[PDB]
């Protein structure tokens, strides 16, 4: 059983932006970064345990890294997955 440690690694970081702020104040939902796989069930369990909050539903999407032109060279950013988590009437963070 590695479910506990798995839940401690799916979550990577919160997402800060205008869309994130308006979603939180209006829809009571938090947007955060997750691992590349990060199935919806794992994200739901991780938020319930680590943040000790009740959740309703999770929506995930994959963001493709942009292609950047650094110096004389061309590079690409890494793809990452962000999840929208909808909390219930009781919210903490």
């Amino acid at each position: 059983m590695i479910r506990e440690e798995r839940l401690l690694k799916v979550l990577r970081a919160p997402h800060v932006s205008e869309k994130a702020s308006t979603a939180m104040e209006k829809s009571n939902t938090i947007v955060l970064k997750v691992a590349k796989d990060a199935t919806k069930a794992e994200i739901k369990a991780a938020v319930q345990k680590l943040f000790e909050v009740e959740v309703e539903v999770v929506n995930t999407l994959v963001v493709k890294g942009k292609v950047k032109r650094h110096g004389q060279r061309i590079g690409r950013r890494s793809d990452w997955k962000k999840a929208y988590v909808t909390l219930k009437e009781g919210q903490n963070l």
């Binding site: 506990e4 440690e5 401690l8 690694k9 979550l11 990577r12 970081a13 919160p14 970064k33 680590l50």
Partner: protein
Amino acid sequence: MKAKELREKSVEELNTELLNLLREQFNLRMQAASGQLQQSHLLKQVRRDVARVKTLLNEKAGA
């Protein structure tokens, strides 16, 4: 911080790994992302500590 935990039983080794993963690994990561972490050297130090514990578990369990 290598031979201090060599003689502990497997039960404590799993316990210390869980709190290493739980605290100072997840919490530090959230702090760094939010910009509230100023001592970024803890992140690497904690990661190496987790590796050390896992190395002991393998040479303890089974083989």
